[PDB]
Amino acid sequence: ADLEDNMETLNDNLKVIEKADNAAQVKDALTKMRAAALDAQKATPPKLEDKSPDSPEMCDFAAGFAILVGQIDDALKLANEGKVKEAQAAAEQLKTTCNACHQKYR
Numbered sequence: 001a002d003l004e005d006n007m008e009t010l011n012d013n014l015k016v017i018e019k020a021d022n023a024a025q026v027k028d029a030l031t032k033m034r035a036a037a038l039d040a041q042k043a044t045p046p047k048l049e050d051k052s053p054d055s056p057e058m059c060d061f062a063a064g065f066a067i068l069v070g071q072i073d074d075a076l077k078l079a080n081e082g083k084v085k086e087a088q089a090a091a092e093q094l095k096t097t098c099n100a101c102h103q104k105y106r
């Protein structure tokens with residue numbers, strides 16, 4: 001799918017997680033987020049459309065999703081262990097990465 005749709009998924013499932021009642025819900029939402037981060041990792045954002053795929057900017061962009069997915073995995077680990085509150089905490093930490101990239105390239 002496309003960037004906007006991916007970012008919607010990221011955003012919706014982040015809310016789902018803040019409101020979550022059980023670990024399956026969280027798991028499920030993180031899994032969806034993961035699939036979206038990996039998709040967005042392939043995209044070229046409007047801001048960077050004139051830039052070489054090679055460029056420091058494009059690499060930085062993709063790296064942000066590498067970090068995001070990494071963190072999502074840490075959150076998934078906790079959710080699989082059924083630590084709901086800790087997984088919710090972890091997902092809140094995601095936001096700094098969302099923001100960091102948004103400032104540069106959104």
Ligand code: HEM
Pocket residue numbers: 003004007008010011014045046061062063064065068094095097098099101102105106
């Ligand atoms: C889980 C954390 C994140 C959340 C919750 C989030 C959410 C969003 C949302 C709601 C939008 C508005 C898009 C729209 O509907 O028009 C957006 C846009 C955008 N975000 Fe994220 N995002 C996250 C992580 C990231 C990361 C890590 C990057 C960079 C690596 C990034 C890059 C962008 C860019 C380039 C846009 C502009 C899209 C466009 O102009 O079409 N986001 N994001």
Ligand SMILES: CC(=O)Nc1cc2cccnc2c2ncccc12
Pocket residue numbers: 053054055058059060062
């Ligand atoms: C940020 C960066 O250096 N990107 C890439 C740079 C590349 C430079 C030569 C050949 N392939 C790539 C490449 N292939 C897949 C995905 C990313 C790259």
